[PDB]
């Protein structure tokens, strides 16, 4: 059975006006800005941007890849696909 989301989990993350986007749940660095309550820090592969999202917007990668894991015209997207498949836990600072 599923657990709660935890740092390191791989997802497709959905934001308004964007396709479901390869992403991960990030850690919060010591001394760094925490998310609001019930929100997770989401790191988007390819663009390397962070947003704060709740579970409604988070689709587990394994389950969802056959649907969402296809090339897209949007900037950063196909780079994002490579990252999530090839080095999803790397530092992208």
HEC letters along the chain? CCCCCCCCCEEEECCCCCCCEEEEECCCCCCCCCCCCCCEEEEECCCCCEEEECHHHEEEHHHHHHHHCCCCCCCCHHHHHHHHHHCCCCCCC
Q: Each residue of 39-77: b (16+ CB within 10 Å) or e? A: ebbbbbbbbeeebebeeebbbebeebbeebbeebeeebb
Q: Which residues pair with 12 in a beta bridge?
A: 22, 59
Q: Where are the domains positioned within the chain?
A: 10-29+38-86
Q: How was this structure determined?
A: X-ray
User: What is the distance between the alpha carbons of residues 64 and 28, in angstroms, rounded to a whole number?
Assistant: 25
Q: Exposed, middle or buried: residue 88 (CB in 10 Å: 0-12, 13-18, 19+)?
A: middle
Tell me the resolution in Å: 1.8
Spatial CA neighbour of 46 closest among 15, 23, 64: 23
The C-alpha atoms of residue 74 and residue 76 are separated, in whole angstroms, by 6
Q: Which residues pair with 51 in a beta bridge?
A: 42
- Specify whether the CB–CB gap between 23 and 12 falls below 8 A: yes
Residue position matching structure tokens 């800005």: 33
| CATH match for 10-29+38-86 among 3.40.640.10, 3.60.15.10, 1.10.760.10, 2.30.30.140 | 2.30.30.140
């Amino acid at each position: 059975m599923p657990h709660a989301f935890k740092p390191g989990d791989l997802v497709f993350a959905k934001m308004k006006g964007y396709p479901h986007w390869p992403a991960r749940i990030d850690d919060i660095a010591d001394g760094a800005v925490k998310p609001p309550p019930n929100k997770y820090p989401i790191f988007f592969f390819g663009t390397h941007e962070t947003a704060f999202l709740g579970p409604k917007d988070l689709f587990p990668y394994d389950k969802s890849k056959d649907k969402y894991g296809k090339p897209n015209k949007r900037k950063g997207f196909n780079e994002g696909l490579w990252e999530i498949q090839n080095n999803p836990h790397a530092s992208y600072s």
